[PDB]
Amino acid sequence: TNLCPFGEVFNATRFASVYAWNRKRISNCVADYSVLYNSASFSTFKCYGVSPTKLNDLCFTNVYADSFVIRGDEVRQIAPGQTGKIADYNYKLPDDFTGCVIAWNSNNLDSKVGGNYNYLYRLFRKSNLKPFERDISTEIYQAGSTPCNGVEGFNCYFPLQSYGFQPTNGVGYQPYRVVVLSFELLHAPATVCGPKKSTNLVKNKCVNFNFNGLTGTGVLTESNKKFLPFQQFGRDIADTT
């Protein structure tokens, strides 16, 4: 019966910057994605592994919600195997990404006159960022010989810089909010199911079944196969259910 607090996520009044990107683990809901899908208020809505319509009527076990504010020009970087500032030093989707990524113009909310000095993005590093690697460290990296001693100096100032976000900018030079979905599957039962309504079960007849998104055709009969409490599925040699 419970639903997903997408309201407080998307309609949130405050967003953190990309390097300090926030996370909200969400579970055990009934999800209606069509409310967003057909909202038609989103400048961009793409994802990989699942069509929107097909995901709406499907169950998943665990989902994460991540959000930040980037630049328009760089929106494309939020995709598997991209390069640039953000891909390298602020955020990097894994290649086999199975979530969903969304972005809309927020020039009317996040931009402000004189330039918004809030949001930040990491600039330099010794190495590439691993999947979902957060780096809040403002430690002055030392690419030289002389000691750094914390102070900002002739070697490698803060790997943290703020956007301008003047409203008077072009399209690509204006902030676009972003919300990255994550869809993962484990052996745990699917908690975040779609808005589908169950039917009664009919035994000893050839039926078209759907159990938690698992489909097939066959006759459902009682059994004496004693599943252990943690086991949900049994399998044949063919790897079929």
């Epitope: 330039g115 102070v151 900002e152 100096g153 002739f154 803060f158 810089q161």
Partner: antibody
Framework: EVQLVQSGAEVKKPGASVKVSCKAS????????FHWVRQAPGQGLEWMGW????????KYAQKFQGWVTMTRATSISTVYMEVSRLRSDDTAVYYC???????????????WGQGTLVTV | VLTQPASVSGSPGQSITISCTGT?????????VSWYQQHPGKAPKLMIY???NRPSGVSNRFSGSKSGNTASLTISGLQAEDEADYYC??????????FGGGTKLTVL
Amino acid sequence: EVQLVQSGAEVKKPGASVKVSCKASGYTFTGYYFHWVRQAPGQGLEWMGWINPISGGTKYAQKFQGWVTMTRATSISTVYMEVSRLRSDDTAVYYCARGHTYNWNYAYCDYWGQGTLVTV
Amino acid sequence: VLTQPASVSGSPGQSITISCTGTSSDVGVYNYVSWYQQHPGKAPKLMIYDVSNRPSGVSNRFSGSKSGNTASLTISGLQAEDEADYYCSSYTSSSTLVFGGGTKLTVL
């Protein structure tokens, strides 16, 4: 164009403190250091220190360490400079000046404010 | 820290020079000199950066040089409006900015 507008002229008694403001505009406020330089009447230029608007990192002149404080407010684009335990020798025109953002560098102060005369 | 002559004078149209003497921790290489012009009752403006480079709007008759631990500012075709205090400035010890004492240039 770069504009730096300082607070008006001050008079203090010996032993008191003074806090001078420098309002910045016409560029990305946080993207550049602010220097303070002072000049006693009929005398040369004396470097006081630098402040980074990002986080608030400072370095002072050695001679003023322990009675100069530099601060900034990023919301209003204003840098402040406070001097405590004032003496007659602290009678000077106090300039804020905008510079580079790489700390270790020559010719730091490029764009200068109008100057604040403080008399002690 | 840097040493300048207190006064330099010249007639309109002449060339004058202003010396700046430092050390191996400032003016000596690795080092870059800047020069400021301070017109009477005004803030300093940058005149020369990087030994000899001029900001836009600085005329070609202002020229800077550096040799070892000394620097010089040359002003050719001296004009009345050149009457100002001139400061050399330099980076010091890979830690701090230092100034010269200032040179009052007077035009005769």
